[PDB]
Amino acid sequence: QPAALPLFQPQLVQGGRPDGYWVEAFPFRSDSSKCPNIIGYGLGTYDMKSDIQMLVNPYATTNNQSSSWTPVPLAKLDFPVAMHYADITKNGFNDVIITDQYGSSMDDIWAYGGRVSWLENPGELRDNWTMRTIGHSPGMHRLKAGHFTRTDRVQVVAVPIVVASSDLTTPADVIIFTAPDDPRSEQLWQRDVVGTRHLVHEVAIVPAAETDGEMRFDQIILAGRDGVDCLWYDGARWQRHLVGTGLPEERGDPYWGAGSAAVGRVGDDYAGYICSAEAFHGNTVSVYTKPAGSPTGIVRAEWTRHVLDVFGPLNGKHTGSIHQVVCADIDGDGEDEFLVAMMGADPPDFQRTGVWCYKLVDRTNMKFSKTKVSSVSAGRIATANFHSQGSEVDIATISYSVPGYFESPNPSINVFLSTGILAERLDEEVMLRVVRAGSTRFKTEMEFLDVAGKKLTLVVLPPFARLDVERNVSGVKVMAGTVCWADENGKHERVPATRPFGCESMIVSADYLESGEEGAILVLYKPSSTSGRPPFRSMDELVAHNLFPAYVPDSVRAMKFPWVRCADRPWAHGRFKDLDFFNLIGFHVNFADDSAAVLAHVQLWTAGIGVSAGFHNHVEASFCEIHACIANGTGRGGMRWATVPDANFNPDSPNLEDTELIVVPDMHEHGPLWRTRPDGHPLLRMNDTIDYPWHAWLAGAGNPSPQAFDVWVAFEFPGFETFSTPPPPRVLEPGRYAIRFGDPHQTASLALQKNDATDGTPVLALLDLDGGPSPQAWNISHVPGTDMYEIAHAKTGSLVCARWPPVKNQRVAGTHSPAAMGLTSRWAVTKNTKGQITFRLPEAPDHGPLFLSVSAIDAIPVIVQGDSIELSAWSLVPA
C-alpha cells in the first residue's frame, strides 16, 4: 500500500491581523516537542510596531476543554524578520532568538539595524520577556540556532539578504554567533563570519543527530542568488558543497538562483532529495536528485536540478508567489513530502495561494505528484504535532500580508490538524468521515460518547498497528478490517461479524491488540467513571455525555445525545406506548475519500425488564445488522428469531415456542441473523432488502422491581458476504505457493499469461519443463469474516477470477476489478486424501458447483467446471 495523505481539520488560530509574515512552532520546553505553542507576527510598518505573539496551545494541557489559542505578547519590536529558538540558559525552557530593526523593505534598510537578540523564557506564561542583544548586521534576514562548531553553547547562524538600501549585488556575511558561558550577563556574543553570499533568502539546518553518524555538527543549507549550498564544520575547518545553482540569471531581473530549499528524508537517507523554490519570491519549484547508489547525506553526492512546476510569470517587479519550502513526513510513511508556501497573486489565482503538498511517488525515477492542502495565503509554514503525542504532522500557516506592498485579505494564522477522522453535524446525528485503514500510516482515536460506564471511541488503525488496552476491561467491536490479540488459548480475531447465530465477547483479555494487513476501524469501549455503573435502574442513571475533543467543530461539541422513549420518536407511528424502550442517535461512519461510501450507522437502545423491542424484519431499509450488548439487565436479555416461515409467525402476538434465543451477555456481540446462502452471500428480497426472519431484542422476563435496563449498540452495515453454512474444515494455511496440476510424472502450473497485470489477462496452466521457466508464485489469503479464499498473483496482485457469467467452461482471467462481494474471485477450499486442494466458486442457487480447473489432460486454458473432480485437484507447493 502506498500511503495516503491524512485528512486535515482546519482551525483559525488568530484572525483579523493587520499583517503577517512569520509563523513558528514553538515548544515551551526543550525536553518536549509535542503540542508546542505558535509564535506569529508580521513585518510591522513605520506606523505600528509588530507584536511578537506567542499563542498558547490549548491542547497542550491534557484534559483540555478549550479550542481558544491565548495570545501572549513577548515583545513589541521595530521591523522584525526571522526567528528561531534554543535553550540559551540551559534551564529546560526554550528561549526566542529574533532579528529586528530590518527597515521597511529592501529599498529601506536600516544602516544601524539588522539586530539579533534573544528573549529569555521565564519558565511561566508572562508577557514581555527580558531581551538582550546578540549582535548586528544591516539587512539581517534569516537565522537558525544549532550546534555548528561546538556542542556546549547555543550557536546561531544569521544572514542578511542585502547590506544596504537597494543594493542587490553586494554579498552579505554569513555569521555565526556563539553564546557566552553566562548569557545573562556579558552582552554581545562571540562572532565569526564563515562566508559571503548573495541574496540569501532561506537558512535550513540538518541536525547532526539526523545523519546517523555522518556528521558531528549541524549542516547549514543556504538558498540564495548563488543557488543551493551546504556549509559545515567538521572539527577542523569549514567546508562548502554546492548542491546546484538554481534559476539561471535573466536580463533585467536581479533575482536568480533559489528563494528557499529544504532537505527531504527518503527511508534510511536523511537527504534522499533536496527541494527548492526559485528564485527570490519566485514561481518555480525544482528538486535536486542524486544517482542510484549514491552515499547517504548531502556532501558526498553529486546533485542535479529538475524543474517540476512553474506557477506563472513574474510581475513588473520580477516577483511571484512562492515564499518557502519545508520537508516533513506528512503521511507517516518514512519519506518526507514537501510543502510549498504560496502567498497569493494579483490578479488573484487559487493555484498560487495556500499550500501544495508534493509527494515522491516513484523512488526510481524521482517523480512527484502534488495535492492542494490549503487555499488561503501562506507566507510561512510551521510543522509539528499541535494536537496529540503521536507522530502525526500538523501544518500551521500565516498569511503573507505586508501593508502598502502585497496584502492578503483577512490576514490570519491557521492550523490544519492531521487526522484519520473528521466529525461533522448532520442534524441530530454526527457524520464521522474516516480514511481507508489500508493506506493510512497513523493511529487515530476520537472519543465520542460517554454512556453506560464506557467511553465509546472511534479508532482507525493502520496495517499491523498496535493498540494498548486495559486487559480484561477494554472492549472492541470491529467495523472494517481485522484485529487480534493473543492469550494463553492462542490468537483471537475480531471482524465486522462473527459466525451466523454466534456470540463472542468484546473484552480484550491481553494488554494490547494489533490490526491485520488491511488495518482496522473499530469502536473501542474504554472504561469510564463518569457515565454510571450497572445495574442501570433508570434512564436517569444512563444520561450520556458528548466526549468529542476540543479540536472538532463547535457545532459538534455543542450537541447533546438524549435517550428518547421509542414511543416518542417520529418513526413510532403510535407504537411502543408505555414501554420502557429507549433510543439514542447517532453516528454515521463513512469513508472520507471520493467514494464517500457508508461503513456503518451506529445507534443505541435500552429495554427494561420484561420489555420486547418488537419483532421486525427490515423490509423497510436494507442493511446487515450486528448488536453489541453493553449491559445485560437480568443476564437473560438477548435476540430471538423465528424458526418458522414468515407467514407462520405473528409479530404482534408472538409465539415464543417458534423462536430460538441467543442471550447476549454484558460486553458481547452476536453474529448475523439474516438469511444467507451456503457460502455466506445474503439472501435478498424483491425490493433489494437483506432478508431476515422475524427477530427482536427481548429483555429477560419478569417484573421490573427492581428495574435493570439492557443497553445495546446497533451496527448497521451495508451488505457483505459472511461465514459459510455449515462451517467447512480448515485445510489450507494462507501463504505463497506454486499451484500445480498433474502427476509427479508431468505437471502444469497455474500462470498469469506473460505475467500481464492488465484486467482480463488469461489464466493458464503452463507445462513445467526441464528447459525450465519455473512456476509462477500465488498469494493465497483467507478473506476475513468468511470461509473463502482469494488467489492473487504474487508479482502483479491480479486476482484469479472467472469471467462473467460463472457457468460451466467459463474462462478464468486476472483482474483488479472483482465483482462485488468477490462473487467470481472467492473460493471455498477442500482437501482430498492425496492432500490436493479444490477451489470452488460461491454456488448460484441455480447451478451446480464450479471448480477452478484445467481444460485438458505449451499452455492449457484454465476454466471453471464442476462435471469432473479430476480436472480440479491442485498441489500447493510453498514458494
Place this chain on the structure above:
Amino acid sequence: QPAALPLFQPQLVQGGRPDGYWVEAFPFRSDSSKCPNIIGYGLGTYDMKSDIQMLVNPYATTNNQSSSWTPVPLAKLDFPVAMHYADITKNGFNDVIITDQYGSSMDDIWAYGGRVSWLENPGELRDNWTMRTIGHSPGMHRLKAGHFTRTDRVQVVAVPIVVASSDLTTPADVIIFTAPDDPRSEQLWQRDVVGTRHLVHEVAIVPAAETDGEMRFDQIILAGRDGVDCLWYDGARWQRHLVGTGLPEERGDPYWGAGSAAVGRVGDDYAGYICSAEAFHGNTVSVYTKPAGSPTGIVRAEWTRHVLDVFGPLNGKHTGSIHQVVCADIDGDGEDEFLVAMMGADPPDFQRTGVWCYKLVDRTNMKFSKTKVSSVSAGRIATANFHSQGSEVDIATISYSVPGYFESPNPSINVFLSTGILAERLDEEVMLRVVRAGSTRFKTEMEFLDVAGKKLTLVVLPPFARLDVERNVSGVKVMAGTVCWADENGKHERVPATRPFGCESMIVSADYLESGEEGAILVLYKPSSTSGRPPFRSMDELVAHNLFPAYVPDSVRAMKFPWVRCADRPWAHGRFKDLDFFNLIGFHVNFADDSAAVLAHVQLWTAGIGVSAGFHNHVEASFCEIHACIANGTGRGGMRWATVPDANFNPDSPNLEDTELIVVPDMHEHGPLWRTRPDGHPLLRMNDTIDYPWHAWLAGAGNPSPQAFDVWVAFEFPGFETFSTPPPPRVLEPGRYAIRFGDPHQTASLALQKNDATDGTPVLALLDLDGGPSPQAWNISHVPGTDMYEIAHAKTGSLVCARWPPVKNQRVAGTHSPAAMGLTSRWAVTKNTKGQITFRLPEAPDHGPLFLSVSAIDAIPVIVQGDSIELSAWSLVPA
C-alpha cells in the same frame, strides 16, 4: 409538509476584533434590501475609540469572484451603543443613525453624553462620513428610525436605559426626534418626549405597511423593567397597550420585566405571537399568546405570558446570557421563527453561547421547538438576504465582548448563509449535501461546472415551485421528485428515469417549468458562452471550468476538473490504451439530513468517432444508471445492449448483431437498460448488484477526420422501481375517492379501523348503512416514475399495505412505514367494462397475482388474494 429549516453555510466576515456589541444589516440604497452591507462595532474602552465599520458585501455586485468583506470605517466614536438607518436626505442612499458618548458601563454614565447623531451616506464607498448631532440624553441606549407621527420626515425613537451612574430606579424619557425640512443645515432636530420607562433594553418597530391597513403609523414595542408594551400614534394622540409585565421582581435583584422582545408573524397576522428574553441580560425565554379568534395585530388583543426556557441561574451581578430576540421567517413558510442571541457564560456553557432558533410547531396550543443554529457568542443578530435576490433569510452575528467585563474569545462577525445545498471537497470530487425537496420552502441554485457549452447547475425546488428557463435552450435532468412544463402538445413530465429503453429530450420547450407535490432536485443545463461550442473537435476545446459561487468553501472554489484519458485512470488496469475515451469526475449528491442518503453520483465522459466505451454489466458496484447526452459527435452516438444471454456475448470482441442501438441525440436522456420485473423492480444478482445485460456507449462509426466527440453525463442512482413491462393502459385519474365494494343494492366501503393513524391498524370494508356513518375518503396518487398507484387515507395519511409477507389471504393494514420500493403498498391498476377498478401488488416471480380484496360477500376484514376476481372489483366515487 411542515417546513424544515434550511442549511447554513458559515462565513467569517471579520475575525480578531478587540471587542464586539452591535451588528446590523445595512442596505446602502433605500430602494433595495438584498445583499446589504454589515455594520459592526463594540462599545470601545477608555483606551480605544470604537471604529464604526461598514463591511462591504462582496456578493452585492452581480458577477462577483470574491468572498472578502472590505471594512470601511464610517466614524471613530467614544462609547457608541445602538444604531439604525433611514434615508434622511431623501436621495436614495441610507444614512446611519447612531448613539455614542454613553460612558463605559451603567456605573459610568457620561452626564453630558448620550448623543444621537447621523452620518451622511455620500452615495459612494468613502470612509469618515459627515456627522451631525440630532440631540442628547444621558444613558442613551437603543434607537430606531421610522414614521411615528408623520410620513414626510425621518423620525427616530431614542431611549436611555438609565439616567445617571448606578441609578437603576429612575425612569428615562422615551424620545422622538423629527428631521427638519433640511437636515443638512439647521442642527438639533425637533424633540418630543412620549413616555418614561424603567431599564428599557430593546426597541422594536412594527412598520405600518406590515399591518394590512390596521395602522397609519409605526408601532413602538419596548422591552424593559416594566415588561413589554406597545406605544403608537393614531393621527390624534399617543396610546399605550400593555403586552405583559415579564419576569416578576426578585428581592436583592434590580432586573425584572424584559430584556428584549420581537413581534412574530403567523400567516395573515403580523402579530400572531410576541417573544421575549427576561430580564436585562437574563436567561429566561418567554412568549406572549392571545386567544383563538383574537383580532390581528397587538393593541386589540389580550396577551398572556408563558415561560418556555430558563437557561440557568444568574451570576453574582444578577445577569445571564441572553442579549436579544428577533423574529424572521427562517424556513420560508409564512410564519416567523424567533432567534435568541446567547452571549456565552462563565463558566463556559455551549447551551448559553450562539443562536437558538425557536419554531412554532402547533398553532393551536402555541407549542415551540428549538434548534441550535450557531454555537459562537452572539451579542446581537442581524437578519437579511446577504447573498442573493430570493426570500431566504441569512443570519449575521457579532460576539459579545466587552474588555474587563464579559469577554468572548476571538471576537468576530460571522454570517450564516441560508441554503438548500452545501458543498464540500472529498478528494478529487465534491460532496453536494441537499435538503429534502418536500420540506423546503426555498428554491436553491448552485452552478458547479462550465462544460461543453453548458453551465451545469444543481437546483433544489420546493413543492409546486416555478423555475424560469430559456425556452427551447435550457435542459433539465431530474434526480429526485418531478417537474413538468406545458406547451401546445400538453403537459410534459420528467422524473429520474423515463421508460425502459426509451429516450426523451431534456430541452424545456416552455418559458418555465414547475415542480410537483414532492418538489424536485435536478441538474439544470444553462446555455454557456464560456465553455466552447459543438462540434467538439479535441479535448482542448472541452476544458471545463469550476463555477462554484464565491460563498462556497475556498477548498471547493480552488478545485479543477480535468478530463483524463480513461487509460490513465487508476481503474483502467491496462485497458483502453490509445482510445479517445475520456472521463471527468465528479459530484456526489447526498441528503444533508440524518439519513445522509445517496441521491446520485454524477460524472462525465467523452468518446471520439468510432470509439466504444466498452461493454460491461456493473457486477462490480450496484447502481441504476441513466445517461444524458450533451453533445452527439456524429448524430449516431448512443447505447447498445446485448439481446442474447450473458454467456452468449463476448464483450472483448462484440458481435453487434446481437445488440440493439438506442441513439441518444444532443440534450437527450435514455431510459433504464437494466433488467426489471414486470412491475418495475430491478433484478438483482447474488452479490446484491442491479443485473444489466452487457451494454456500452459507442460513438457513431467512421474515421475521426474530422474529429467530433460525444459528451455525456452518467447519473448513478441507488436501486428504485421504474416503469412496467409492457406499459399498462391508463385507466384511473389520481384524486380523492370513497372506495366501494358490492352491488348498487348493498355496498361496503374501504375503511381504516376507527380512523386510527397507528402503524398496523386494520383496513376493513364497512357496511354502508342508512343509519349512515358515511364512507371514509382515500387519496389515490400515481407513484412518479412507475405505472403504480398508492392509496392513502385522507385523514391520517396511512398507506394501504399488505402485512408481511404478501401471500394469499394476508391481512391489510394502514402504515406510515412501507417496505422499501413500496413493495406491499403499491398497486397496478386495471378497469373492467363495468368500470370497476382492481388493485394488484407487485408480483413476486414466485407467486400468482394478489389483489386488494374483501374477505367475504359490521365490518369485513380486507385481504390480498388472487383466486377470485369477484372479491377485488371496486367502484371509485369522487369524495
